Design a protein around this ligand. Structure first.
Ligand code: GTS
Ligand code: GTS
Lengths: 208, 208
């Protein structure tokens, strides 16, 4: 397999974590895409991924798989024992719900805040910025942090009693928030402790 | 199973078509959520779905599954023969990629445009509106139509050889387009051809 990404990107992390977690990290050669130089927004790369984002997976036959969820879906099913994605119908439903919610209410808003209300990748890559929109998404990420705090009050993992794709997404969201210095509120003690523990999980530890 | 939704909603259409496609539509009871009245934004429904959107599926054990993708993922896995969601690892990856991209580049943008650059659900519900952002999202959806047009020139269905959840998402994007009178470009003939077919699928035809 080939992956196109940037090694310290919060979204690329989700896949890198999943790969370690499946013991498949060895299977992959990574190719660098420089986002600061806008390489992802160039015709060559849009040919690989219309959305212009990283990571992207390229199979041995040349099939391209973009989107973290989709790539994780693929690599988790590859070995016949879904570990991150759900075994039963209900596990599949709950993990996908909390994964999507993790994107919606935490990770995406942090990323939109970064690109629109901060300089982001810089005045040369960010052609249109909507400051007020990026701020609305910051506010949404803050509420999202509170939300995951109440979830992780009740449970050790976001989607039940096992580590899943959904935990990987929350981790990446807090990786991104740390990068742009959007502080997890003090009152979210469960989220903060859980995060510091997650940073020591072998799959996450190796990454950082 | 219980579904909380609004019958004519484009996102609720995604689960209704999937339910028909699995022949589970008679196993579900539908509860009306009035979006015009802002019922999805009140604390009563927010306890059900922190994200404040429809549809939400309720199982017999009181489990609530939010998000069209997660709901579909649950019901597709239920009879043990995944039709909409993918059998092989390769099929899950691609279907999930295209399903998500359908959300990103078409469906979600039309919906954001509706809420932000038109009057949407009205002022009692649209308390915050960013017109410039909604307008940019409308252009994003127009580009998305062109993108899915290029795809459908080369494939019978969005995710490849067979009908999937990814087709359902574009259907719903096209339904939303019509609500807001965002015309599909006449030049997008592969997309228009595919949609014409979609309108005569029993599951889709039922819903329309
Ligand atoms: N489940 C969807 C989101 C659903 C959604 O946006 N639904 C609409 C309903 S509809 O417009 O399609 O009928 C909604 O609740 N929107 C109300 C709002 O955004 O205020 C998802 O996959 O994230
Ligand atoms: N898997 C994609 C990743 C999306 C994404 O935004 N990736 C980032 C990479 S990183 O910021 O996390 O390192 C990107 O390419 N952003 C580039 C841009 O928005 O210009 C998804 O889930 O939508």
């Amino acid at each position: 397999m080939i992956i196109y990404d940037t090694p310290a990107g919060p979204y690329p992390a989700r896949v890198r974590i999943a790969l370690a977690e499946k013991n498949m990290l060895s299977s992959v050669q990574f190719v660098r895409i420089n986002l600061w130089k806008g390489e992802h927004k160039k015709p060559e790369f849009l040919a690989k991924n219309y959305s212009g984002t990283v990571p992207v997976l390229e199979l041995d036959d040349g099939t391209l798989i973009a989107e973290c969820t989709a790539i994780t879906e693929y690599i988790d099913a590859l070995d016949g024992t879904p570990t991150l994605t759900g075994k039963t119908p209900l596990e599949k439903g709950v993990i996908h719900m909390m994964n999507k919610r993790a994107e919606l209410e935490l990770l995406d808003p942090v990323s939109v805040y970064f690109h629109h209300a901060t300089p982001g990748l810089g005045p040369e890559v960010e052609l249109y910025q909507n400051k007020e929109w990026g701020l609305r998404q910051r506010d949404k990420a803050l509420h999202g942090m509170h939300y995951f705090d109440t979830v992780l009050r009740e449970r050790p993992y976001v989607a039940g009693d096992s580590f899943s794709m959904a935990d990987i997404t929350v981790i990446a969201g807090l990786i991104f928030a740390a990068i742009v210095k959007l502080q997890v509120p003090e009152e979210c003690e469960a989220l903060r402790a859980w995060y510091k523990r997650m940073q020591q999980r072998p799959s996450v530890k190796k990454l950082l």
